[PDB]
Structure formats: C-alpha cells, structure tokens
C-alpha cells in the first residue's frame, strides 16, 4: 500500500485546478477594439472613403 502514502490528488487534477481558465491575451484588447474603431473611423471621419455624413445630413446643392 505504498500508493496510499502518495498524494491522492493527481498531477492532472493539479494542472486542471491551477490552469483552470485560458488566460486573456494582452493583444486581444488591441485587436478587437482596433477592428471596431476601424468602423468608427470609416463611418465618422469626413476623410474616410465610405463616410456616413452624406447619408445622414445629405447635402444642399
């Protein structure tokens, strides 16, 4: 019964109770918010190619 003197909690249970959640990358914030502020740029810049100022306040010619 030498196995009952060993710690009963496995190494697998340590690795799954210690590294439980996949950690959040530091670049995820930059990638996601830059992909969304690209749409903020494209809609609302006055120098963006597909700007939404002429669809919203149309013109007066």
């Amino acid at each position: 019964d030498r196995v009952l003197s060993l710690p009963a909690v496995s190494k697998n249970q340590v690795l799954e109770n210690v590294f439980h959640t996949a950690p959040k990358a530091p670049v995820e914030h930059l990638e996601k918010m830059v992909s969304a502020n690209s749409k903020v740029y494209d809609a609302l810049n006055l120098q963006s190619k597909r700007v939404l100022i002429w669809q919203v306040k149309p013109a007066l010619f």
Partner: protein, 81 residues
C-alpha cells in the same frame, strides 16, 4: 418664394456681426459702398439699388441630394443619434 420681393439696400445690415468676416456698407441714397473683408483676400464693389432688387428675379431653389431620400436620411440621422 414669391415672384416679386421688396428688399435690398433699405434697412440692410450696416455691419457684420462676428469678427470672422468684416463687412461694411457706406450707403448713400442711390448706391452702396461695400468692402467685404475675409482674412487674406478682401473684395470691394459698388452694388447698385437695381442689383439687389434684380437678384431675386431668378431663384436658386436649393434642394438636397440624398443617397436614398430625405425621409430616409432623417430616420437614419435619428438612428445615428
């Protein structure tokens, strides 16, 4: 607007209201001495009494060029706001 209008060189603005552009009229009974002053370039002329009455002979009649319509653009401006 109407086909005959009755404004020009009488109770006109004698000066501009903001300092972004300077405008003075030295109006006599017959004609006017206007010097419009905007930054780098300033212009000056003598505008007749029969020119400010002849200006509304043709109308500009401004109209909006919209992507789809003016109603749709009002609704889209509300959705954007």
């Amino acid at each position: 607007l109407t086909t005959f209008t009755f404004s020009g060189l009488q109770d006109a603005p004698v000066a501009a209201l903001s300092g972004s552009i300077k405008l003075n009229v030295a109006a006599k009974a017959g004609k006017a001495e206007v010097t419009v002053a905007a930054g780098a370039a300033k212009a000056a002329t003598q505008v007749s009494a029969a020119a400010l009455r002849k200006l509304s002979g043709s109308k500009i009649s401004l109209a909006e060029v919209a992507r789809i319509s003016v109603l749709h653009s009002s609704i889209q401006n509300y959705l954007l706001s």
